[PDB]
Amino acid sequence: SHMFVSEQSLNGRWTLKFFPQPAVPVMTIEGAEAANGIVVDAVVPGNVEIDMEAAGLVEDPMVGNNIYKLRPYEGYQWYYSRTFAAPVVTEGQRLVLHFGGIDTFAEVYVNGIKVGSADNMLIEHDYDITSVVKEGENRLDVIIRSSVMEAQNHFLGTLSIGNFSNEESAPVRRAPSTYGWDIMPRLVSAGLWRDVTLRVENPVTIVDANWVTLSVNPKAREASESLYLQTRLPFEMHDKVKAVITISRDGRQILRKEALMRKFANLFTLNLSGVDAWWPRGYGEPALYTAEVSLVDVTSGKIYDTKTSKIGFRTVKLELDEVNLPGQPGQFQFIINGEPVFAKGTNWVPLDALHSRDASHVEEAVQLMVEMNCNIVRCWGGNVYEDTHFFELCDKYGIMVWQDFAMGCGNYSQRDNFAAALEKEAISVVVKLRNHPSLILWSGNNPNNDRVSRQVLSRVIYEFDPTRPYLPSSPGYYKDPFYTENPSQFVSQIGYHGCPNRETLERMFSPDSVNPWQNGVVGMWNDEWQTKANRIYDDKFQGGRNDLMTNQVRIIFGEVPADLDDFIFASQSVQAEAMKFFVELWRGRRPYRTGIIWWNIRDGWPLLSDAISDYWGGKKQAFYYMQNVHHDVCCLINPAANGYMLKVDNNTLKDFEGVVEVKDVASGKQVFKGKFVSKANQMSEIATLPMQKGQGMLVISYRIEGNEYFNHYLYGEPPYKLDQYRKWVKKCGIYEL
Amino acid sequence: GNVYEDTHFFELCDKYGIMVWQDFAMGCGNYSQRDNFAAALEKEAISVVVKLRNHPSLILWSGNNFKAPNNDRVSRQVLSRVIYEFDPTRPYLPSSHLWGPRGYYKDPFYTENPSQFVSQIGYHGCPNRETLERMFSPDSVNPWQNGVVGMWNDEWQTKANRIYDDKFQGGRNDLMTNQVRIIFGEVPADLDDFIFASQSVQAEAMKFFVELWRGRRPYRTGIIWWNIRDGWPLLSDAISDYWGGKKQAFYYMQNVHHDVCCLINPAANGYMLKVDNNTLKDFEGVVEVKDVASGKQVFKGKFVSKANQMSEIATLPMQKGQGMLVISYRIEGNEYFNHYLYGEPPYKLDQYRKWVKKCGIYEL
C-alpha cells in the first residue's frame, strides 16, 4: 500500500507486432516498424501465445501435441506498443515507469528515447522518465528479443553442459522450467507478464521500510520490532519532515511514534506490549499487525508518502546437527519463536507455463494448502519468484515459505559477469520479500567452491536479511529401503506417479487418444500420452517416464487393468498409499525426523505427473489420503520388526487426550482400543499391535475433544487383488471411489 | 573516526619514539560488501600504506570494529590484501564496551577483566574553569539550570556533544554526576567544588587503571587509555581540553607513567607495594611510604627493580579507616612521588581535599 501521489495503470490493450529475428537482433524503433512482421491485439499483463491464440494464430497448447507447434516462435521478436497520457508533475516530483515483469531481453523506449535495457524476467524494472516525457500523448515501445538466441553469446563450462537444466537456461536469468522440464512443458514465451504502471513520487518519498523482529515473548504478549527506514529527503526538507509509525490491528492502535527526520536513513527501535506472535499452522495463530510509516510536513501537515504493510512478530532460527552426519544436508530443524516445529508441506512448482496467468491461480492454489493443512511450502528454483500477494496469503494462513533462488540443478558460471547479474537479482528479491513473516529460509540449491552458492548469494543475505538462515545446499516399491532408510531428518520426499481424474483426461487428450494404450496393447502409450508425460522435444519413442505408472500398479496390484476407469483407480491408489506411508513414516519417527516436504500439490500444465491434483483443480485420490495424515493430531500405524506400532503425533503446543479404536475392516474384529495422552510437539507410542494374518486393512477411529477422525493402514505384502482393495476402501468408509 | 594525519605527525613520533597504532578510517558500524565500496577502499588503503610504510614509529594497521562476524569483506579481505602486497613488515589486526559500567572504577568488570592489552578506557572530568567561561555564554557558565543541581542547561547539553539540537535533558552529561555520587556521596552545588569533584574522580579512576595494569605484568601487555586531548571545546572524558587546560588526571597519570614507578595495588587482606620497569636497564632505590592523615610510617626499605618486569616489594598492612598513603621513592639521586587512596566509597569531598594537600604532589 505504497501511497504514491499518483499511480496510473498502463495495463490493457496494447499493439503486438512479432516477426522472426534476423542475424543481428532488432533493437531500435526504426528497425521494428520496418521489419516485415505480423500485428495482432495484445493484452498486458499477458503472454504472447495468449494474444496469438486469440485471433486464431495458434491452437490451444494445453491439448494434445499442440504444444510443439509453438517451436518456431522461440526465435521470434515481439514489439509491444502503446500510447499513454502523461500526468502533471510539480517541480521536484519524479515520474517512474514501473514494470512488474518483462520476459526477458528487451529495450524500453519512451517518446523515441531509450529509457532502459532489460535482461531479467524475475525482478521488477523501474525507469525515471521525467526528462523524456512530454505533455499529452506519449508513445511507449518495448522491443523484446529471442531469449534462446541470447544463450549463444556466452561460452558455457563443462559443468553447465549436460544437466537436467537446458544449456540455454544457464547464461540467462530466466526461470529454468520455461526451457522445459519433466513436470512443466517447454514454453520460453515472452511478453510483459506483470503489471505496468506510472508512478508520481514526491521529492520527499520513502525508498524502503524494512521491518525486523528482534525478539518476541509469546507469553506476556511482548515483542521488539525494528524499522530500517531509508528515505529520499532534500536537504531543505531536513528537520522539517517527521516520520509517523503506526502499528494497529483490527482498527485498534497498538503503537504510534513520531520522530523528526534529521537524516535520510534512520533506525527506530520499538518495544511493544500487548501483541501476539506469528505462528505457523498448528503451533498457534498467524497474528498479523498492520504497520504504517508516513513522511509528513511538521508545519503544513501534508503527507508526502505513506507505506503500509502487514507484519508478524516472529523469530526464525535453523538449528544444525553436528552429531548425526555433521555437515550432510538434511540434518537441521526449524525453530520458530523458540519452539522446534515439525514441517509438513509441499513443494511449489509453477502455476502456469504462461506465467501471466499465475496471479489468477494463487488464490485457489493457496487454498489447496489450507485444506491440506501445510505449515510450510518450498518455492522451487525453477518457478519464477512469486509476487507479494502469494506471500500475503501465506502470512494470512500461517504457511511458512522456503524460497530457492531461481538456479537450475546443474552447476553455473564462476566468472564475474554472471555473478554481477545474480547479485542484482538477489538484492531485488530479498529487499522485496524480507518483510513477510511467512518466509523463513533462503536456499541456493546446488563441491563447496561455487561462487554463486557460497559467496554471491550469501553476501547478499549477509547485508540485507541477517534475520533469516541461508542454506547453500539443497536436493519401485514404496517400502523399499531406498525410502525407509533415508538418512535425512528434513526430507524432500520424491513423489509417485498418478493418473489424473477421468474428466481431465477427456479434456487434455483428443477423443481418439483418451484411451492410453495405442493399438489396444496394454503397456504401450499413444503419442499424446507420451507428450503429456512431458517430452520437452518432439522425439518419437516408446515408454520412458510413463512406464512408472504401470510399474507401480504392477508391483502393488499384480497386473495393470485394461479398463481406463480401473487403471485410474489403480494408479491413484498406489500413489495414495505411497504418499500416506511416507508422511506416516516421518511423523512416526520423531523426534529424530524434523520435517517432510512432499512433491507436489498442484501441476502448472495439463500433464500426467507425480502430483496429487492437476492443473484444472482435479484432486486425485492421493489428495484425500494425505489430508488424514496431515492433521494437527493424527493417529497412524507404522511397520515394526516383529509386528506393527500404533502411534500418535502432535504438531501443536497443546496437550490432548482421546481414545483410539483399531479394528480389521474385513473381519470386523477389534485389534486394539484404549485411551491415549498425546503430549504436545512430540510423537507418543500407544501400543504394539499383533501381526494380523494374510492381507487386509485396519481402520483407525480416534476421537479428540468430541471430534471423530479417521485413518487406516494396509497390512500384508504385495501383490493385492484390485477389486479386493476397492472392497476394503469402501468398507472403511473414509474415502470414496 | 579521525583523518589520516600528515607526514609531519609521524615524523614527530619517529623523533620522540612514540609507536603508532593506525586504525583504518571506519567507525563503529559494519560497511558495504559490494564491489563499488571495496574498490574505493583499496585505492585509499594503498595510498595511505605506501605513504606511511617508511616511518619506524608505525607498528600495526587495524580495520576497527542478536542474529549470530568474520565474514566482513573489507576488514578480512580488501584491507588484508593491501597489507599483504604493500606492507608485509607490520602486522594487520582484523578488528579492535571496554568501558562497561561507567560507575565505580573498582567494579569487578574492571578489576577482573581477562584482557592483556586494553585499548579503550576513560572516565569523565569537568574541564577547567577558564575553559568553561570561554566556551559557554555568561548566563550558562553555571551548569545547573534554574539552580537545580543535577539538571544541565541547554548549552551544557550541547557541549556534551548533541549531534542534533534535540531538546533532551540528561544523557552523556549524567556520567559526570553519577561518578561524583558514587565516589563522594553527593554532587557539590558550588562550581569550583564540582570541578574539583569530577576531575578527582577522573584522576583516581585513570590512575587506578594504569596501576592495576602495570602492577600485574607480564600477563598485562599494555594499556591504551582514552583521549589525552580534545579536538573541540567540549565537556568530555579527556584529561586536557582543546585550549590546553590540563585537568587533574593529566598530572596523576604523569606520575604513574614514569620509566620506573612505585605503586600500590589492592590485595586480599591488605595492600601490596610494587615497582614497574619499562626499560632494558636494572635500577636500585629506596621507597618510604607513610599515612598522610597521621604521619605514621607504614613501610620503608630498599628495592631492586629488574629491567622489563614488575617486582613486588612487600605487603602492606590493611589500614582501618579512610585516608591516603603518600609514596616517596628515590632512584639514582632523584625523588619521585605517587599516592594511594584506601578505604571504601563514599568519601567526604573536603576531606579528600585535605589529604591531597598533605601529599604535596598536586595543586588545587
Side-chain angles (χ1 to χ4, degrees):
Chain A
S1 302
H2 208 159
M3 188 266 303
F4 305 103
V5 76
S6 301
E7 184 150 9
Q8 168 187 344
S9 174
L10 292 191
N11 300 288
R13 297 177 63 259
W14 293 45
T15 296
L16 175 56
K17 173 183 179 176
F18 53 94
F19 52 91
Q21 173 177 314
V24 52
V26 182
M27 292 168 50
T28 71
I29 315 175
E30 296 81 19
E33 303 182 20
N36 196 338
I38 311 98
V39 186
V40 296
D41 292 323
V43 174
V44 179
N47 283 25
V48 292
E49 293 91 1
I50 283 288
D51 304 320
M52 288 194 302
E53 186 172 356
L57 264 292
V58 69
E59 303 179 357
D60 190 8
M62 299 198 314
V63 170
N65 301 1
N66 291 358
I67 171 73
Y68 304 96
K69 306 174 179 180
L70 300 163
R71 186 73 201 279
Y73 295 133
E74 304 176 356
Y76 271 62
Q77 296 190 227
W78 318 89
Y79 176 31
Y80 279 80
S81 187
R82 200 204 196 273
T83 55
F84 64 96
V88 51
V89 285
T90 72
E91 193 183 35
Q93 287 181 345
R94 181 186 298 188
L95 182 62
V96 176
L97 174 57
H98 174 269
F99 281 103
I102 304 181
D103 183 357
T104 298
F105 299 90
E107 310 295 303
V108 186
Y109 284 90
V110 174
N111 288 330
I113 303 177
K114 182 185 298 184
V115 297
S117 300
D119 46 359
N120 184 297
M121 63 162 289
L122 309 122
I123 70 181
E124 308 180 351
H125 305 269
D126 292 7
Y127 315 98
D128 187 4
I129 56 177
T130 38
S131 57
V132 304
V133 73
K134 70 189 188 64
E135 57 183 357
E137 175 180 337
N138 310 267
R139 57 178 312 177
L140 176 56
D141 305 310
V142 180
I143 314 174
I144 302 173
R145 314 183 291 288
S146 169
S147 310
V148 178
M149 292 304 303
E150 276 288 345
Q152 303 181 27
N153 300 327
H154 311 263
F155 186 84
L156 293 186
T158 301
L159 309 167
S160 304
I161 307 168
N163 307 138
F164 282 85
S165 75
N166 204 300
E167 286 82 293
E168 304 159 344
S169 176
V172 309
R173 289 309 307 128
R174 310 187 54 242
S177 73
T178 62
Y179 287 86
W181 215 264
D182 63 356
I183 48 170
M184 290 290 307
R186 174 161 178 116
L187 192 38
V188 307
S189 182
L192 279 42
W193 63 282
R194 268 176 181 171
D195 288 316
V196 183
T197 58
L198 277 177
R199 299 176 179 176
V200 183
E201 302 173 343
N202 287 332
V204 176
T205 182
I206 295 177
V207 180
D208 181 79
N210 180 21
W211 299 91
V212 169
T213 306
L214 290 188
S215 75
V216 54
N217 198 338
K219 301 186 179 184
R221 301 187 58 192
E222 293 184 342
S224 297
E225 192 78 9
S226 291
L227 177 59
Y228 294 77
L229 179 66
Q230 302 183 44
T231 64
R232 183 196 310 162
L233 191 63
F235 185 77
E236 286 181 334
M237 300 305 299
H238 277 62
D239 307 321
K240 301 182 183 60
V241 184
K242 63 171 185 177
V244 177
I245 308 167
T246 306
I247 308 293
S248 51
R249 184 183 187 181
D250 296 332
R252 290 300 178 90
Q253 175 187 115
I254 285 84
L255 179 144
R256 192 183 191 96
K257 183 182 184 63
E258 296 183 6
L260 184 62
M261 299 291 303
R262 306 171 175 277
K263 43 188 181 178
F264 74 103
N266 298 265
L267 205 182
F268 305 101
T269 304
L270 277 49
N271 289 340
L272 305 90
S273 184
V275 291
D276 293 320
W278 183 93
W279 291 94
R281 299 191 71 92
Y283 290 97
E285 295 287 341
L288 292 181
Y289 286 78
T290 300
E292 169 180 326
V293 48
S294 307
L295 307 179
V296 47
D297 199 339
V298 301
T299 52
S300 64
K302 182 181 180 181
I303 307 173
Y304 301 104
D305 200 8
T306 296
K307 203 173 182 183
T308 311
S309 60
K310 292 178 182 176
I311 60 178
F313 304 114
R314 160 221 51 84
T315 56
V316 64
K317 180 197 178 304
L318 197 74
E319 190 182 26
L320 284 312
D321 194 313
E322 279 75 41
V323 182
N324 309 276
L325 299 89
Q328 186 261 0
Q331 311 302 283
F332 54 87
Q333 184 177 17
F334 288 99
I335 280 77
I336 277 75
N337 307 334
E339 301 292 340
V341 298
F342 182 86
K344 46 181 198 301
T346 88
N347 293 282
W348 194 264
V349 294
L351 298 171
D352 202 317
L354 305 169
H355 296 283
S356 56
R357 302 184 294 189
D358 282 355
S360 64
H361 292 123
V362 299
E363 203 77 50
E364 185 184 20
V366 164
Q367 283 297 331
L368 295 182
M369 299 188 305
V370 179
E371 313 181 35
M372 194 62 254
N373 198 29
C374 306
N375 55 25
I376 199 186
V377 58
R378 176 186 158 241
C379 299
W380 179 43
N383 195 2
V384 180
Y385 308 104
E386 296 282 358
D387 211 296
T388 318
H389 188 45
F390 168 77
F391 292 87
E392 293 177 1
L393 297 179
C394 299
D395 299 333
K396 181 180 179 180
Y397 301 104
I399 300 180
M400 304 184 301
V401 179
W402 175 332
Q403 178 68 60
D404 310 302
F405 286 96
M407 312 290 308
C409 69
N411 214 0
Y412 278 85
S413 179
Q414 307 287 305
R415 296 183 300 280
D416 297 320
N417 290 118
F418 179 84
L422 186 66
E423 172 176 329
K424 176 181 181 173
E425 169 183 329
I427 298 177
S428 182
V429 60
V430 162
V431 177
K432 174 180 181 183
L433 306 175
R434 62 188 192 182
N435 299 321
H436 296 279
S438 57
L439 187 53
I440 60 172
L441 187 135
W442 300 86
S443 166
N445 293 341
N446 187 280
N448 320 303
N449 308 358
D450 190 1
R451 284 188 49 178
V452 164
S453 52
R454 287 104 192 177
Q455 170 183 352
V456 179
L457 295 176
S458 60
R459 210 168 285 182
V460 176
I461 308 291
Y462 183 30
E463 193 178 359
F464 296 101
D465 192 10
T467 79
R468 290 179 185 79
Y470 169 69
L471 283 177
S473 57
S474 173
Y477 191 22
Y478 61 91
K479 294 190 176 184
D480 190 288
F482 170 72
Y483 308 100
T484 64
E485 294 181 1
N486 190 277
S488 302
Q489 314 178 16
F490 205 90
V491 80
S492 176
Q493 184 58 58
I494 310 298
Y496 267 44
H497 270 262
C499 183
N501 294 10
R502 179 179 179 86
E503 187 177 2
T504 298
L505 270 57
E506 300 171 341
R507 186 180 180 179
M508 57 186 295
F509 295 109
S510 302
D512 54 9
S513 298
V514 175
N515 182 265
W517 304 288
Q518 187 181 75
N519 309 317
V521 55
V522 183
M524 313 305 161
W525 317 88
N526 55 78
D527 202 14
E528 289 203 359
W529 274 70
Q530 285 278 114
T531 65
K532 288 308 205 171
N534 206 5
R535 186 180 59 183
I536 318 177
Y537 291 91
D538 213 8
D539 285 315
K540 306 307 174 302
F541 63 87
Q542 185 54 236
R545 180 179 169 99
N546 283 307
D547 288 354
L548 303 183
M549 304 177 59
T550 54
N551 288 13
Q552 294 168 11
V553 306
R554 181 174 293 100
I555 295 177
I556 299 304
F557 292 140
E559 59 182 7
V560 47
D563 176 61
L564 183 54
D565 305 310
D566 299 326
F567 174 74
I568 294 173
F569 175 84
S571 191
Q572 290 195 6
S573 292
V574 301
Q575 175 189 54
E577 291 290 344
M579 303 303 297
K580 182 186 71 62
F581 168 78
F582 292 142
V583 176
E584 290 174 352
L585 192 62
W586 260 258
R587 291 192 59 175
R589 286 173 170 181
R590 294 182 64 193
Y592 178 82
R593 307 302 187 184
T594 58
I596 170 168
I597 308 267
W598 34 278
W599 192 310
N600 51 310
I601 197 169
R602 179 184 163 292
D603 294 303
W605 200 249
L607 291 176
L608 314 153
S609 87
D610 48 10
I612 67 174
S613 165
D614 53 67
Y615 171 89
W616 292 307
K619 298 177 179 180
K620 301 174 184 176
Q621 193 62 233
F623 185 87
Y624 307 97
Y625 279 57
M626 295 275 290
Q627 287 188 264
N628 289 326
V629 302
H630 265 75
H631 297 299
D632 291 351
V633 278
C634 172
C635 298
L636 55 94
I637 295 178
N638 292 135
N642 303 343
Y644 313 138
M645 181 65 66
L646 178 62
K647 301 173 179 171
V648 66
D649 189 59
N650 198 326
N651 299 127
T652 77
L653 299 179
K654 303 179 302 178
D655 301 334
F656 288 97
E657 294 180 348
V659 56
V660 55
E661 178 188 4
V662 181
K663 88 175 183 62
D664 192 300
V665 76
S667 64
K669 189 262 302 179
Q670 174 182 287
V671 185
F672 178 85
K673 197 191 70 175
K675 294 197 299 294
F676 60 94
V677 182
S678 173
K679 285 191 175 182
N681 204 344
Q682 66 170 114
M683 183 275 305
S684 298
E685 299 178 345
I686 284 81
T688 300
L689 303 187
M691 327 202 64
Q692 300 304 306
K693 187 265 171 184
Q695 298 176 351
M697 179 180 298
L698 305 180
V699 56
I700 313 173
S701 54
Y702 56 98
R703 165 189 294 265
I704 291 183
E705 296 184 355
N707 290 116
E708 286 278 348
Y709 308 93
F710 305 103
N711 195 19
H712 77 273
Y713 174 80
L714 172 134
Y715 65 89
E717 278 293 321
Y720 304 88
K721 297 300 181 178
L722 186 141
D723 297 327
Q724 194 170 7
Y725 174 81
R726 187 191 308 270
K727 152 204 184 303
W728 294 338
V729 171
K730 193 182 304 184
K731 212 171 196 304
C732 267
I734 311 169
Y735 315 101
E736 77 171 9
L737 304 183
Chain B
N2 194 21
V3 308
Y4 297 144
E5 290 286 346
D6 219 330
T7 313
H8 196 209
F9 170 81
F10 290 89
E11 290 178 347
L12 270 70
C13 290
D14 299 332
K15 178 182 181 178
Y16 300 101
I18 304 182
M19 304 180 300
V20 182
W21 173 342
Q22 184 62 66
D23 296 0
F24 275 104
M26 261 151 303
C28 300
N30 335 89
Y31 281 83
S32 169
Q33 308 283 298
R34 296 173 293 280
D35 295 321
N36 298 77
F37 183 81
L41 269 72
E42 188 186 45
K43 174 181 181 175
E44 164 180 334
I46 294 175
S47 179
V48 65
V49 161
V50 174
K51 179 186 180 186
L52 308 177
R53 60 183 182 180
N54 297 323
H55 296 281
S57 57
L58 181 55
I59 54 176
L60 182 129
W61 307 88
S62 171
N64 203 2
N65 330 119
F66 56 100
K67 288 301 176 181
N70 301 336
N71 298 125
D72 183 4
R73 180 179 176 182
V74 171
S75 60
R76 278 91 187 180
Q77 313 180 7
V78 185
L79 300 170
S80 323
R81 184 183 302 176
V82 181
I83 308 298
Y84 172 83
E85 188 175 8
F86 299 99
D87 195 2
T89 73
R90 298 173 180 83
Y92 176 84
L93 193 59
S95 298
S96 177
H97 195 215
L98 203 45
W99 318 276
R102 308 190 196 184
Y104 193 20
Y105 52 90
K106 297 186 178 182
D107 189 288
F109 174 85
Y110 304 130
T111 306
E112 306 170 353
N113 196 289
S115 293
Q116 306 179 7
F117 197 141
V118 283
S119 55
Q120 290 135 351
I121 190 65
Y123 262 68
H124 265 272
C126 185
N128 298 345
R129 158 174 286 279
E130 184 177 354
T131 69
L132 291 179
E133 303 173 350
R134 185 175 177 178
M135 64 195 274
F136 291 108
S137 56
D139 57 8
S140 298
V141 182
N142 188 275
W144 319 128
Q145 193 179 36
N146 297 91
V148 187
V149 288
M151 314 303 172
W152 318 90
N153 57 81
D154 185 61
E155 291 201 351
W156 277 64
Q157 292 284 124
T158 300
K159 284 301 193 169
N161 212 90
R162 281 191 323 204
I163 306 168
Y164 292 138
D165 182 60
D166 176 58
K167 296 316 190 185
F168 94 93
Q169 171 66 242
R172 180 179 171 88
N173 270 324
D174 289 351
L175 295 177
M176 301 174 57
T177 52
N178 291 337
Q179 293 166 2
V180 178
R181 182 173 295 100
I182 298 181
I183 298 303
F184 292 138
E186 63 179 1
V187 181
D190 179 65
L191 179 54
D192 288 312
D193 298 331
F194 174 78
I195 292 178
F196 170 80
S198 188
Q199 293 192 21
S200 290
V201 180
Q202 180 188 69
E204 288 289 342
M206 300 303 297
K207 182 185 70 66
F208 174 78
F209 292 140
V210 181
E211 284 174 354
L212 196 63
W213 232 253
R214 290 185 78 175
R216 278 204 274 201
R217 295 179 46 184
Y219 177 82
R220 298 313 165 71
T221 62
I223 171 150
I224 295 181
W225 31 276
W226 198 220
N227 44 16
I228 189 179
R229 173 192 185 276
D230 291 313
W232 195 260
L234 289 166
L235 314 167
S236 80
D237 47 13
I239 71 180
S240 86
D241 53 70
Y242 170 73
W243 287 309
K246 305 183 180 183
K247 309 178 185 180
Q248 282 297 124
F250 190 94
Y251 305 105
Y252 281 55
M253 298 274 282
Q254 202 172 5
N255 286 326
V256 299
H257 267 105
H258 297 300
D259 290 353
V260 47
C261 165
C262 295
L263 45 84
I264 293 181
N265 300 130
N269 288 255
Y271 325 106
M272 173 79 68
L273 179 65
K274 301 176 180 176
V275 63
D276 190 296
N277 193 324
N278 292 146
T279 76
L280 299 178
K281 303 178 301 178
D282 303 327
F283 287 101
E284 297 180 349
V286 56
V287 52
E288 178 188 4
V289 180
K290 50 193 295 294
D291 200 322
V292 311
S294 63
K296 179 254 301 179
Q297 177 183 283
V298 295
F299 182 84
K300 180 184 178 63
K302 299 173 295 182
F303 60 92
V304 48
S305 179
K306 283 195 174 183
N308 221 345
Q309 58 178 110
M310 181 274 304
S311 302
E312 295 176 335
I313 285 82
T315 305
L316 275 304
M318 171 183 173
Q319 309 296 305
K320 38 186 177 182
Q322 297 181 357
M324 190 170 303
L325 257 60
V326 64
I327 305 175
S328 305
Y329 51 103
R330 180 81 167 272
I331 295 174
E332 293 187 355
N334 288 116
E335 288 283 349
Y336 307 96
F337 307 105
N338 196 22
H339 71 275
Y340 178 85
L341 176 67
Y342 67 90
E344 296 290 325
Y347 300 85
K348 207 178 180 61
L349 186 139
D350 57 1
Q351 202 171 6
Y352 176 84
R353 192 184 304 261
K354 295 154 45 63
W355 302 339
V356 170
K357 298 165 57 61
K358 299 292 299 181
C359 296
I361 320 176
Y362 322 95
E363 298 188 9
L364 300 175

